[PDB]
Amino acid sequence: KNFVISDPRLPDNPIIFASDSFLELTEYSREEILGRNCRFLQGPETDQATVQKIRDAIRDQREITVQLINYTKSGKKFWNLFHLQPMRDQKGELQYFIGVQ
Numbered sequence: 001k002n003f004v005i006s007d008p009r010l011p012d013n014p015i016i017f018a019s020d021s022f023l024e025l026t027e028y029s030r031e032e033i034l035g036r037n038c039r040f041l042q043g044p045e046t047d048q049a050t051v052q053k054i055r056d057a058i059r060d061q062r063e064i065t066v067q068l069i070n071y072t073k074s075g076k077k078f079w080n081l082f083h084l085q086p087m088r089d090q091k092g093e094l095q096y097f098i099g100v101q
């Protein structure tokens with residue numbers, strides 16, 4: 001129930017949907033999320049080596065799980081177990097990415 005959907009067919013693969021659980025965890029309103037790339041949750045303590053693996057997984061359109069530090073609106077650190085998965089259409093072509101926190 002804690003998930004976001006991004007559209008890679010739009011500039012910079014922005015979040016088009018976020019579940020109420022995701023808004024509660026990050027302390028952002030729906031209006032502050034829609035249209036942004038998910039990277040805005042990152043900050044000083046975010047391991048750049050883990051961010052690299054996510055970039056490679058998106059490029060290759062492979063599913064991946066990783067732990068990384070993210071920041072709430074009020075600058076509170078929390079660990080995030082992130083399960084990234086591609087979503088393909090009936091013609092086997094990529095439409096969306098789904099993330100789980």
Ligand SMILES: Cc1cc2nc3c(=O)[nH]c(=O)nc-3n(C[C@H](O)[C@H](O)[C@H](O)COP(=O)(O)O)c2cc1C
Pocket residue numbers: 004005006013037038039041042051052054055058068070080082084097098099101
């Ligand atoms: C559906 C989806 C959800 C994502 N959720 C997160 C997240 O919760 N935290 C995070 O640090 N990165 C998340 N990312 C990855 C970042 O938005 C971004 O891909 C990452 O920083 C690497 O790309 P960049 O090098 O262009 O920033 C998510 C990506 C997708 C497609």
